[PDB]
Amino acid sequence: GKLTNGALEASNVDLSKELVNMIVAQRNYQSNAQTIKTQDQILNTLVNL
Amino acid sequence: VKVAGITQDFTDGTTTNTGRGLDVAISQNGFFRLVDSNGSVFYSRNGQFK
Amino acid sequence: MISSLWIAKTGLDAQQTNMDVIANNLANVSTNGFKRQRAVFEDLLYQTIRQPGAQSSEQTTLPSGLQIGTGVRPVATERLHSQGNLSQTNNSKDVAIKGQGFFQVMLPDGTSAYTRDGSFQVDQNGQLVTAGGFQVQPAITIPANALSITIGRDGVVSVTQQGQAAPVQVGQLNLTTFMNDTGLESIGENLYIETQSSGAPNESTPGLNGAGLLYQGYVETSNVNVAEELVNMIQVQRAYEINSKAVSTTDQMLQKLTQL
Amino acid sequence: MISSLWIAKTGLDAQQTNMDVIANNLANVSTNGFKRQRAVFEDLLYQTIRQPGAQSSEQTTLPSGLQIGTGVRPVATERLHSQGNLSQTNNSKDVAIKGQGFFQVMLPDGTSAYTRDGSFQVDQNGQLVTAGGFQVQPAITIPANALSITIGRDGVVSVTQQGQAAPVQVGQLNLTTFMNDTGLESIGENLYIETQSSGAPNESTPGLNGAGLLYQGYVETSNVNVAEELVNMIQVQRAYEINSKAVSTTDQMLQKLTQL
């Protein structure tokens, strides 16, 4: 590529995409925590026999 | 699940005028070549030079 | 040691398998080109005792005899092959399939696996490879002096060199389709290998007799639905707890008998 | 007093050790330059009974004989020497490590200890000391009328004096590297001492050889990941309850024996 003098190459991070990805990742993490909690309430129920 | 890897989106970003003569922007492909105090070779897209 | 204990010991194991399937589906909610699993169950033995339909008298038959049954067993976990939603992540090296075909990839041992993941990279030698470093087939090399990579809807890979107004074709991407997509054996790393229940690998071009279409800059996400998995967890948890209660009731019954 | 009771007692002790490791990891979240611990277990001895592979007849061997095993024992507690997150405190005296080196300090016993903590102070004598007052070899004396301290990426310490246009070098901070980093014996107060399994201390400047670089104004936070510890705590609690249930079952069987 060619060099442009007097200019800087800024970052390529789009904030809207990052925010929506953060939201969906939070929901997925909560779902995984929920199934973790279910496996225990199952192990605890088996223990209380 | 297993994390196969972490990539880096090597697409050209914004070009912003700065008004200083020592900043260079690389459109399209290319990497600036640097050497540290040890002598290793490095590559960087940041054109903020001094 | 007693019949109801074995039956409720099979119920526990089947519900644990269902929970395992649900948890595995929820863990891979973000992996591209994923197909979620579904466990199927079937009845175990049925002890005959009094035979159903047995001739009690010389003219009267016994309807629906004493058929005491055994627990449950799972046949298998089948992959729900549906089209995951496509995502526009705008990179020239990501390709997504629109139909029901598979990419062919050559394993290091010389055999060929089949993957629907479209996140492709370029190795140091210039070949298209899967993100796990497995080289794609039938080999699409990419020159060092490449300016843009264009993969069309027909799988044709073109590379535009510097200062040249015409693109250069560097290969042709083909899709493999099977009689039975479920019977493929998953070997991990988003890879499936051929099994005799999956028929034979039929190679086809993308748009003809049944291979899917390829879209560049798109990634095929998983078909896992979170809400349905949540509801299924709530129902599997209740079923497991109730079967454990059956175990406990059998245990209490055996206690009094022994005490006698 | 019975074999299963000893096995369950060993399991309980191992799970308690795991819980202590988790608690120690949790207690040192705010410590700087702390490396989390992980415990590794091994399975104990085996009562032989019938030997596996013993010749039963003149030609037929016995496959997989009665190997009744004993409980479990923890072998080791290993540190995870990984680069923790760097935190900017904007202090002229705080130093952070970027690689895999160690700072060398002198205990008042006369032996040398090694610490990765970088929160340094100056004593009333003007020397560089650790927050516990241990003097930081190979020894940096800071003059009385200092205006600012500059510690370079390679370890050169300079002091800017009033009326002098040039900085004055007052020492050189060095890093010690070990061939085996996990073999160091932790004596507390963020100090590790060398053992015979920790190789020999190789002193080097930050940048040369393999030692890491020094960042001024930064502190190395602990590498403890908390959510993993919470999940491990849940697992440890459930496993401890299961082992306690095994103990209870053994106790009940012994009780039903006595009355006979």
Curated annotation (Swiss-Prot), chain B:
Protein name, per record: Flagellar hook protein FlgE
UniProt subcellular location: Bacterial flagellum basal body
Organism of derivation: Salmonella typhimurium (strain LT2 / SGSC1412 / ATCC 700720)
Domain of life assignment: Bacteria
Coiled coil: none
Family: Belongs to the flagella basal body rod proteins family.
From Swiss-Prot, chains C, D:
Subcellular location: Bacterial flagellum basal body
Superkingdom as given in the UniProt entry: Bacteria
Family: Belongs to the flagella basal body rod proteins family.
Native source species: Salmonella typhimurium (strain LT2 / SGSC1412 / ATCC 700720)
Pfam families assigned to the protein according to its UniProt record, in alphabetical order: Flg_bb_rod, Flg_bbr_C, LlgE_F_G_D1
SUPFAM superfamilies: Flagellar hook protein flgE
Protein name: Flagellar basal-body rod protein FlgG
Gene coding for it: flgG
GO cellular component, one term: bacterial-type flagellum
Any GO BP annotation: bacterial-type flagellum-dependent swarming motility
Keywords noted in UniProt: Bacterial flagellum
Major subcellular site: other
Upper lineage: Bacteria, Pseudomonadati, Pseudomonadota, Gammaproteobacteria, Enterobacterales
InterPro entries: Flag_bb_rod_N (IPR001444), Flagellar_basal_body_rod_CS (IPR019776), Flagellar_FlgE/F/G (IPR020013), Flg_bb/hook_C_dom (IPR010930), FlgE/F/G-like (IPR037925), FlgG_G_neg (IPR012834), LlgE_F_G-like_D1 (IPR053967)
Subunit composition and interactions: The basal body constitutes a major portion of the flagellar organelle and consists of four rings (L,P,S, and M) mounted on a central rod. The rod consists of about 26 subunits of FlgG in the distal portion, and FlgB, FlgC and FlgF are thought to build up the proximal portion of the rod with about 6 subunits each.
